[PDB]
Amino acid sequence: XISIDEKLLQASGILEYEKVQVVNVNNGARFETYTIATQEEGVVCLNGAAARLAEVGDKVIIMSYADFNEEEAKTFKPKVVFVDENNTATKITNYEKHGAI
Amino acid sequence: XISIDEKLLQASGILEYEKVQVVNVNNGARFETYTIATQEEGVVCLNGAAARLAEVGDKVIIMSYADFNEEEAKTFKPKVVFVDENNTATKITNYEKHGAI
Amino acid sequence: XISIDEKLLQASGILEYEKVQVVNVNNGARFETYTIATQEEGVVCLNGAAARLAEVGDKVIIMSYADFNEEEAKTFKPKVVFVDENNTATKITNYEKHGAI
């Protein structure tokens, strides 16, 4: 694979070549792949086998996960990036208690 | 995503934002997502792409996993929470040998 | 399972018995299994249940993943192996920034 605007990788703190789970709201597909960065603005491109799991225009949610010890886990707040129809970031924040944004 | 009554997260020791495997007894679907806590009692709500993998009323089993060294693993007992039709906890215990509850 | 020419395991730095994600470009299948090495040149053979997820001639992408601390992750470059129609390596390199090869 998933080639993603480097701006969105930066905003979400997802590294190039990081494993991500991608889920497609339109068709319900769920898969794992790794990211590739592109300088081309607004791009979210599914390459290879993943191409069969989406069509242009589909809405996807791209997630990265990490492992924590129990103590660190208690206080960790995930980073969330929201975008507009052009894949431009509109909000970058961290989750608060009870899914608050 | 899965928004879950904070009472059930507390009972199971699953943290908000923890990765969980969710399996649907009605339709056999199996997926991974992360939890969101809600103060609203009895709620188990599938958001986003996961919405396509269940209908209201479906029975689901929600599991979290952890990594252990070999020695710790020998003696670890998972936490199990059973609920009624209203998603109210009816039993909270730990597995004993041979799946005993 | 997946029995793979030891030459390709060597080239990619994937160990025998390592967990791999295999995705099939022809049919979109995605699965995880482990590798078995074979001395037989050019072989990529799906054994067991995985046999139902490909036909001879299908193009597959075989990936291994690893866990890193945040600092090491910043500078890690994955190894990539490209092959010809006979599964002979044509290029072995590491990813550079922005998916450059």
Binding site: X1, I4, L8, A11, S12, G13, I14, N24, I36, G42, V43, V44, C45, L46, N47, G48, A50, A51, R52, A54, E55, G57, D58, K59, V60, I61, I62, M63, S64, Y65, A66, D67, F68, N69, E70, A73, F76, P78, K79, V80, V81, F82, V83, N86, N87 | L15, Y17, E18, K19, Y34, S64, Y65, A66, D67, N69, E72 | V25, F82, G99, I101
Partner: peptide, 25 residues
Amino acid sequence: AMNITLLKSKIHRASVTEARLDYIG
């Protein structure tokens, strides 16, 4: 010691702009 897995970050509802089956890279 026991490790658990949390969501680290997400990009919510991005739009797919291209889907390239035969990608070489």
